């Protein structure tokens, strides 16, 4: 009765996609971690209403050419994409118009819910991105915005609720 | 010298000496023991290229298994949702 | 010349003296020009480095994990061989 | 429920260890081959006597930067050793002492058996280890000598028969 939900995680590279995949589905923070080479799968069972779920996270490759001909195996029956900046990095912000015509061009269905997704949010000091610019470009993406930390995962939106938020939204099919 | 003389050529003799330990020899010396150089660095970018395409092959077919293993559940999950419906 | 005079020597000497300064400047060129070429190679030499040893790192785990399964399943399998003895 | 026999193939590189250990469980000829990293690891179940064993083959790596920190994880619980040697190489063949010394100061029983295993019999007109050089090697240190082809599987000694022959010897513990 066990089924899957596949959400490929998107960003620049350094925004922190194996951190946060990792916080999520080992419940720790990585003792250290290199450039992503490809993807790196993470699944999590988790149960909602009784049923059982496979959350598979897919962290994808940042670098360009560790990420070379591996974009339509991210997009095959992706179940949802969670697109990832850094608060503390502009120019990780600047990038998501390109990430998402990347998404807009491989996806092959018009219903597959997407995120929003700042970490690094206990950088407090040297953040960037004010959340009202990445609130408006969320909203007008039809997207939800999380400001988050994988490193200290109960700060602002918590980590865990941001998976199992969305886990939620696509096992009931809801808005 | 304050007043150089002819014999000042002796000096000159110094200098067709001190040039032809660099003049011509260590031009064509430095340029085939660098073009060694650019031989290894090929070869290790050679090295690189073939470790990384080798790399990025290998995850390019366990995401393709990873993808027909979902497919696989996703089809036994419709199919019993068929024979429910009945 | 068949008798060579003064004027022969001299356009022969600023000729030469041309073509040294050539040299230099084509000898100058290469005199550190291949000293960062050496950086370059130290630097993909080091990341072809990187590279092996994280993929050697996962080898091992994978041998690692692999030797423990196997005697995982010998000591398994002896308690059924044993169980079955009571 | 099924026995493992964990079986090293080691020797230098470009012998043919990938290509002999695939055709023993794949029943192929690779479509290609890279340097091994690391160790590959082809497993094959086989019905001796009545009882299924699972043969499981470590096709190591011969070059040095390739094996690095890795012999410790080859020879923990082996039961049995595959030396290789290029038959077109006599250098393959000259390294063989050196891989015995690292055997023997690993190998932590002194009942594993140990087998030679020339390859590539099918390049005759190319040979440079006369068989009854390996010969005296293999009887000197208390091996079978087996000449045999992983492309041309049938040549010589059958690339089957070896293993097969090797997995019975362990199956019951017989001399060889
Ligand atoms: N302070 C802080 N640092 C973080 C956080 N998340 C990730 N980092 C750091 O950001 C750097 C990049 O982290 P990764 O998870 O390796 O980055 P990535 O997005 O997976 O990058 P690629 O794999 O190359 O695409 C690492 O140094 C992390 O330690 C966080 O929540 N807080
Ligand atoms: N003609 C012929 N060529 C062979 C045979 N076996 C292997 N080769 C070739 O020898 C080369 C080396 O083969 P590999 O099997 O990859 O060598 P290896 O021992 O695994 O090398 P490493 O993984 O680096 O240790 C390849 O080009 C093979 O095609 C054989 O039986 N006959
Ligand atoms: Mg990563
Ligand atoms: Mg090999």
Same mark, same amino acid.
């Given at each position: 009765?066990?089924?899957?939900? +596949? ?13 946060? $995949? ?19 799968? #993470? ?8 049923? #059982? ?20 195996? =991210? ?5 949802? &994409? &969670?697109? *990832? =900046? ?17 998404? +807009? ?5 018009? @219903?597959?819910?997407?995120?929003? *997704? ?12 004010? $959340?009202?610019?990445?609130? +408006? ?9 999380? !400001? ?8 602002? @939106?918590? *980590? ?8 939620? +939204? ?6 | ?9 002796? $000096? ?5 000496? &001190? ?5 011509? @020899? ?25 470790? *990384? $395409? ?29 024979? !429910?419906?009945?």
């Amino acid at each position: 009765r066990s089924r899957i939900f +596949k959400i490929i995680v998107i960003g620049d590279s350094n925004v922190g996609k194996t951190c946060l $995949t990792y916080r999520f589905c080992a419940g720790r923070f990585p003792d250290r971690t290199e450039a992503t080479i490809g993807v790196d799968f #993470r699944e999590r069972a988790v149960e909602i209403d009784g049923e #059982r779920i496979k959350i598979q996270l897919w962290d994808t490759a940042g670098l360009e050419r560790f990420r070379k001909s591996m974009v339509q195996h =991210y997009y095959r029956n992706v179940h949802a &994409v &969670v697109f *990832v =900046y850094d608060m503390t990095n502009m120019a990780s912000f600047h990038s998501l118009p390109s990430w998402i015509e990347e998404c +807009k061009q491989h996806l092959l269905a018009n @219903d597959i819910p997407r995120i929003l *997704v700042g970490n690094k949010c206990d950088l407090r000091s040297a953040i960037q991105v004010p $959340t009202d610019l990445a609130q +408006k470009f969320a909203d007008t993406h039809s997207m939800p915005l999380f !400001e988050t930390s994988a490193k200290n995962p109960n700060d602002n @939106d918590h *980590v865990e609720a941001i998976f199992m938020t969305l886990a939620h +939204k696509l096992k009931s099919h809801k808005p | 010298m304050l007043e150089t003389n002819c014999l000042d050529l002796r $000096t000159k003799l110094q200098d067709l000496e &001190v040039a032809n330990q660099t003049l011509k @020899d260590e031009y064509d010396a430095l340029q085939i023991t660098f073009t060694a150089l650019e031989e290894k660095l090929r070869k290790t970018t050679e090295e690189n290229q073939e470790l *990384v $395409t080798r790399w990025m092959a290998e995850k390019a077919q366990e995401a393709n298994r990873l993808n027909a293993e979902n497919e696989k559940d996703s089809r036994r999950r419709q199919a019993r949702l068929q024979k !429910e419906l009945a």
